[PDB]
Write a protein that binds this ligand. Structure first.
Ligand SMILES: [Mg+2]
Lengths: 226, 216, 279, 493
RNA sequence: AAAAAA
């Protein structure tokens, strides 16, 4: 693998046009491209994969947020603790209305995507994609349980279909699941013992971080509750 | 003027009312207090008396407008943002429906300016808010605030209404108002200059950012 | 100067206390001072048991003013923000006064500001118990031309009219909240209830330019007797005031009414008079 | 099109407002106070003029609720939505059957439907009443003057009436149908007491019922007969599950001791009295409803569209005429003329019949025929505004009030004041020589420049002066930065 | 310191 360090020279020649991305920084004065994080450089597209527990607002990202406040203009939703609030408009719901407002209390789990996210402006999310049949699991998440994981474990789970988690958990139990890019995973089952079994697995899988240890953990966790 | 030219705080200048004889008719001079003066009450011969008394050390000026105005000019405080004045401000934060700033200097009248000295790391500096509808006369309804102003950019505006005792309400609707001084990437890059009214370019790194520019 | 030196020391009405079971009948409708727990009704405060129709409740021995719709109250502006005014009526919360609930003639601080007293009516009530004030009337507005005095809120009962005219050319404004305002009788005060059977100066801060001493000492004496009736815990009515004002005329100087033995004298005089001619 | 039921009514509409609102109540069942005693008129106060009071005002307050509303009973599940069918009542023969059917019930859920576009006061269209095991849909068009017999059930304190937002329902009941409600329980006010996030009906059918609905047919015309499938679906859905929510909310209130408050606010809703705009109280209240609660309703119209206080006489006549025609042909003021089109008449002011017809998007039917008259009202208003078309003055009368020789007196008393005050001052001259810190503290700023030898050299005070003169001169006039950009797309002449 | 019916 090719490991990258901040401040190091950029291997990619400046001759051929290359689109930017997360992980690299374009100097507003010297106009030189330099890495600002530590990880593996992926060139297809140029970006850097680095370990981070803190999520930042970005366009077209699926996130699971919690309503921390209800205003007259929009909703105040926290995608993560201590981070700045996000603006969820009333018109950001399917079958929107003028006078009539969507029913959401403080503490309700919402599965939405980030539409407009500026660095110097308050981010905004919408409870309907733009668009994928208006139903990618978007909306209020009733009951269930959520778990905090690092951003590395969250993105690989949602995007990569070769990740042996949804594959190994589907065999142990039948359930619906929603994964956000802010390190939040929402899983709901029928019986509470199944949800608890799923929580303990992801908690241990994220800690150990091993692709081939998924089946081993899931086997001993589901047999522990019985 | 038959009245003392130099006046220290507490020095008597002129009584309440005055009159003179000219052209076979009595002309009534009405003395009114002004900046640096204060109408107070004195006692003498067992009888009350009201007279204009200077409260600031400086020279006395008697002027008339289309009545005699008595004011004392020192050798800032008097200058305060009022409806119609032009004010140089700096962007403190950006929201979606508006843009709040802080007042630095105020344009005088016939350029010269009056710099308001205050601590910017406390919040004692006067704060002002520019509404999204007050950005430009062109398309007042839909205006993208991100493509107009920027944190740190200097904006020349004109105050409409003072509102409450917290924030001032400015506007950049006209041509001579808008972002004056700004740099690339929120101040990280080089200096940028105003070319088009809705476009600001930088003749150094070749960077171009969308702002609300004024007329040179 | 008066001193008191003491050494060595520092169809019946049921009295209930917090925690006591008032009744074992779940039929009654739960009111104030009572909480529901397993078909049993327990008292949350200490006072008398009030059984009226289906509604069961407990009346506290002492409590702040409870705002009701239609109450004529006197309040002071506590703060001003946005498009509302928050007035202190001496309740649990600050009453609110909307911009549409006042009279605009042809910068809210130019009308009403912090410190200003006014009389108003409780237009409606919020869910938290807060009151919505309403000043749109010829009988309501900003207060002036007199002096303010405060009595316990439980000493002024509701009435059809709380603005009474009294001998001495002065006018009392008995608020249900206990806040009372005495003032010089104006043109509106003289003929108010009578013509019914027959505007930039309303927010002015300046009093009447000519206040005679005959009215000032009247305002003064009327204040001393009201706080005297309040000292004896006597319910203040328009009749109790007039009687006290006349009963206090046996004292030449007005300042003699500030004494404890004098206040209880005027108070006991009305109690015995209304008892004698009442039976 | 659709024929208005006003012509099909047994009695013609009266938009005269020449007399105070007289209730259409004929029989007064379940009343301990005689009708003749409540048919009188209240004495006129300052704000309240002469008007007929609420008939059941004495019945609503004094009467007691059924002791079974004060106990916590288990919820009663609503009948199956797909299995149960709504019963339509369009004849008096099946109205009597429903009347005796409601008398054997403990509580009923009622909600109304209204249309205010083809009528001035508006007209009650559909009334949906639902019991525990069945639902009803009562037509208030054909059956209108005969619905007064429902007062036996509606004014009975034994039977609990379950409404939602009855603040407008009580008005519509007593106005058109002459119905009154004694023993009301408004679920809306109940939702407020609990602290529910939304006090709407769609939320109660969601959280406490799990029946997803939506606002589709509300402003829609309900006068159309018969009723379609999605309309009758929304019609019955209002009161169907409403009895289920009634129990659930009632249980919430008892355990939280908030039941006394809800029934209190409910009675105040039921005692709401309707009255015309003319004979309305001068003091605005929530106990009396009227179409216009402001003495000058044209005031708020101007401030909304930023109309200056000059064309007020124009917008007044345009408003009064719009109200005159609306009360003539029995139509809504917006149907005669919308506010947006009226604004075009105030802003543009067409002096001819050509400018009146063609404005904005479209023009309605009422102002099209009277467009010639509208051209005259504008010419009359412009004639009126042109018909109507103290600083030193107030001071001058005050200067002649004060004595003129007194000015010479107060000046002489001013001259003798200064000469006897500031003119006398004698003290031995004392040097301002420094005692301690007076030598070093106010020290003038000096600068030094070390040379190659390392010897300190005092910078002249004139040196820094020409430095400022050089800077202020160079900064005042900046050299214009000129930069050229290639433009291969431009061509010469 | 928005809210409910139609
Ligand atoms: Mg309804």
């Amino acid at each position: 693998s090719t490991f990258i360090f901040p401040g190091d020279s950029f291997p990619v020649d400046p001759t051929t046009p290359v689109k930017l991305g997360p992980g690299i920084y374009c100097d507003p004065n010297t106009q030189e491209i330099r890495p600002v994080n530590t990880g593996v450089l992926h060139v297809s597209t140029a970006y850097i994969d680095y370990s981070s527990k803190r999520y930042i607002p970005s366009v077209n990202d699926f996130v699971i947020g919690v309503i921390i406040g209800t205003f007259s203009d929009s909703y105040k939703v926290s995608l993560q603790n201590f981070s700045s609030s996000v603006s969820l408009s009333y018109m950001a719901f399917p079958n929107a209305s003028k006078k009539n407002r969507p029913t959401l209390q403080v503490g309700d789990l919402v599965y939405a995507r980030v539409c407009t996210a500026e660095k110097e402006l308050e981010a905004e999310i919408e409870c309907f994609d733009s668009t994928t049949g208006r139903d990618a699991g978007f909306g209020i998440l009733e009951d269930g349980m959520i778990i905090d994981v690092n951003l590395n474990f969250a993105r690989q789970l949602l995007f990569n279909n070769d990740f042996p988690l949804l594959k190994v958990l589907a065999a142990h139990t039948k359930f619906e699941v929603a994964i956000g890019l802010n390190g939040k995973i929402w899983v709901k089952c029928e019986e509470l013992s199944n949800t608890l079994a799923c929580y303990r697995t992801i908690m241990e899988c994220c800690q150990k971080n091993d692709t081939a240890a998924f089946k081993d953990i899931a086997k001993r966790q589901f047999k522990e509750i019985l | 003027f038959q009245f003392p030219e130099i006046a220290y705080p507490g020095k008597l200048i002129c009584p309440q009312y005055g009159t003179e004889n000219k052209d076979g008719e009595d002309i009534i001079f009405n003395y009114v207090p002004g900046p640096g003066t204060k109408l107070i009450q004195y006692e003498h011969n067992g009888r009350t008396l009201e007279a204009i008394t200077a409260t600031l050390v400086g020279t006395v000026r008697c002027e008339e407008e289309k009545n005699i105005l008595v004011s004392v000019l020192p050798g800032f405080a008097n200058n305060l943002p009022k409806e119609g004045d032009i004010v140089l401000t700096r962007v403190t934060r950006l929201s979606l429906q508006r843009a709040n700033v802080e007042i630095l200097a105020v344009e005088d009248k016939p350029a010269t300016f009056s710099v308001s000295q205050a601590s910017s790391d406390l919040g004692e500096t006067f704060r002002g808010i520019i509404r999204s509808q007050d950005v430009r006369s062109t398309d007042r309804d839909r205006v993208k605030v991100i493509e107009c102003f920027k944190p740190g950019d200097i904006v020349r505006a004109q105050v409409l209404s003072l509102g409450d005792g917290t924030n001032y309400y400015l506007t950049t609707a006209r041509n001579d108002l808008g972002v004056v001084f700004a740099r690339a990437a929120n101040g990280a890059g080089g200096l940028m200059y105003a070319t088009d009214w809705q476009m600001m370019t930088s003749p150094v790194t070749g960077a171009t950012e969308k702002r609300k520019c004024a007329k040179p | 100067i008066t001193i008191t030196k003491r050494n060595g020391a520092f169809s019946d009405s049921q009295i209930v206390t917090p925690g006591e079971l008032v009744t074992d009948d779940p039929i009654w409708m739960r009111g104030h001072g009572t909480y529901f727990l397993d078909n049993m009704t327990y008292s949350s405060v200490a006072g008398t048991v009030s059984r009226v129709n289906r509604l069961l409740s407990v009346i506290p021995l002492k409590g702040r003013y409870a705002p009701e719709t239609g109450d004529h109250v006197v309040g002071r502006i506590a703060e001003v923000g946005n498009k509302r005014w928050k007035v202190d009526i001496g309740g649990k919360q600050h009453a609110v006064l909307m911009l549409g609930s006042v009279n605009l003639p042809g910068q809210m601080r130019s009308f009403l500001k912090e410190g200003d007293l006014l009389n108003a009516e409780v237009q409606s009530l919020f869910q938290d118990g807060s009151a919505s004030l309403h000043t749109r009337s010829l009988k309501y507005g900003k207060l002036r031309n007199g002096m303010f005095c405060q009595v316990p809120s439980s000493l002024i009962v509701r009435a059809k009219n709380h603005t009474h005219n009294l001998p001495g050319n002065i006018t009392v404004v008995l608020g249900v909240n206990g806040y009372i305002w005495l003032r010089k009788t104006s043109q509106m005060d003289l003929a108010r209830d009578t013509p019914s059977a027959n505007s930039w100066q309303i927010y002015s801060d300046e009093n009447d330019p000519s206040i005679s001493n005959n009215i000032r000492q009247a305002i003064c004496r009327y204040a001393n007797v009201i706080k005297a009736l309040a000292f004896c815990e006597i319910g203040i009515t328009q009749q109790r005031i007039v009687s006290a004002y006349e009963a206090s005329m046996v004292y030449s100087n007005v300042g003699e009414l500030i004494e404890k033995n004098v206040m209880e004298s005027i108070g006991s005089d009305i109690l015995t008079a209304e008892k004698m001619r009442g039976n | 099109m659709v024929e208005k039921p006003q012509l099909k009514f047994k009695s013609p509409i009266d938009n005269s407002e020449s007399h105070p609102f007289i209730p259409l109540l004929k029989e007064k069942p379940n009343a301990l106070k005689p009708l003749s005693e409540s048919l009188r008129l209240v004495d006129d106060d300052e704000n309240n003029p002469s008007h007929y009071p609420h008939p059941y005002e004495y019945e609503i307050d004094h009467q007691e609720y059924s002791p079974e509303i004060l106990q916590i009973r288990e919820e009663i599940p609503s009948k199956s939505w797909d299995d149960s069918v709504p019963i339509w009542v369009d004849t008096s023969t099946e109205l009597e059957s429903m009347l005796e059917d409601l008398k054997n019930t403990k509580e009923i859920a009622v909600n109304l439907e209204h249309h205010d576009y083809r009528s001035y006061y508006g007209i009650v269209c559909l009334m949906q009443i639902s019991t525990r095991e069945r639902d009803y849909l009562v037509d208030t068009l054909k059956l209108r003057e005969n619905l007064h017999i429902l007062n036996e059930v509606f004014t009975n304190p034994s039977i609990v009436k379950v409404f939602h937002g009855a603040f407008m329902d009580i008005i519509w009941l007593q106005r058109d149908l002459g119905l009154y409600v004694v023993g009301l329980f408004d679920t809306y006010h109940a939702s407020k007491a609990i602290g529910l996030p939304r006090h709407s009906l769609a939320y109660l059918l969601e959280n406490f019922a799990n029946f997803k609905t939506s606002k589709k047919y509300q402003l829609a015309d309900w006068r159309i007969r018969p009723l379609s499938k999605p309309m009758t679906a929304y019609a019955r859905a209002d009161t169907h599950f409403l009895l289920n929510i009634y129990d659930q909310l009632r249980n919430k209130l008892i355990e939280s001791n908030k039941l006394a408050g809800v029934l209190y606010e409910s009675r105040n809703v039921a005692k709401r009295r309707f009255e015309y705009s003319k004979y309305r109280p001068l003091t605005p209240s929530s106990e009396v409803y009227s179409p216009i609660e402001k003495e000058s309703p044209w005031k708020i119209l101007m401030y909304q569209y930023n109309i200056p206080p000059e064309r007020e006489v124009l917008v007044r006549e345009l408003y009064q005429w719009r109200d005159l025609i609306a009360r003539r042909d029995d139509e809504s003021p917006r149907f005669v003329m919308p506010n947006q089109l009226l604004a075009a008449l105030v802003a543009y002011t067409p002096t001819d019949v050509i400018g009146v017809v063609s404005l904005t998007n479209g023009v309605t039917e009422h102002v099209r025929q009277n467009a010639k008259l509208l051209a005259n009202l504008i010419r009359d208003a412009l004639r009126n505004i042109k018909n109507t078309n103290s600083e030193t003055k107030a001071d001058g009368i005050l200067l002649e009030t004060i004595s003129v020789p007194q000015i010479r007196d107060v000046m002489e008393r001013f001259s003798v004041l200064c000469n006897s005050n500031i003119s006398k001052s004698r003290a031995k001259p004392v040097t301002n020589s420094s005692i301690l810190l007076g030598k070093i503290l106010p020290r003038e700023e000096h600068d030094i420049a070390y040379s190659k030898d390392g010897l300190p050299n005092k910078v002249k005070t004139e040196d820094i002066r020409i430095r400022a003169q050089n800077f202020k001169s160079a900064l005042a006039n900046l050299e214009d930065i000129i930069f050229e950009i290639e433009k291969p797309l431009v061509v010469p002449v």
